[PDB]
């Protein structure tokens, strides 16, 4: 009937089509910012603590005395690689749970277990 392919059934029938929709459906306004469980984890692995916890501005005193007092210390990010010390923080990346305390005078170090190439003889 055609020249060589017009529309045949087995050749490229396997896409994904999940356009679905949505915009905003449960979008809630409260003052007090609801409990949810955040994880909440050290350096490399020294500490690695995850529970629920509901704070606004304090939340901040969290990070800082859950482990060590200190009165002043430099939060960071190995996430992207950024220091903060103000609220700001949270405010600086997506929505997320990551929290490292730290003193000055500290980089961050190569952290990744993916697929590194330390396996590939057997």
Known sequence: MEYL?????????????????????RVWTS??????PFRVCDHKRTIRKGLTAAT???????????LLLN????????????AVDSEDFFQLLE???CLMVL??????????????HHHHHH
């Open 5 to 25: 392919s017009a529309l045949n059934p087995s050749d490229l029938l396997r896409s994904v089509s999940n356009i679905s929709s949505e915009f905003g459906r």
């Open 71 to 82: 009165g002043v210390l430099t939060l960071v990010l190995e996430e992207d690689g950024t």
């Open 103 to 116: 003193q000055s005078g500290q980089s961050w170090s190569p952290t990744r277990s993916g697929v590194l």
């Open 95 to 97: 929505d997320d749970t």
């Open 56 to 66: 606004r501005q304090e939340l901040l005193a969290k990070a800082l005395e859950t």
């Open 31 to 36: 003052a007090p910012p609801p409990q949810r």
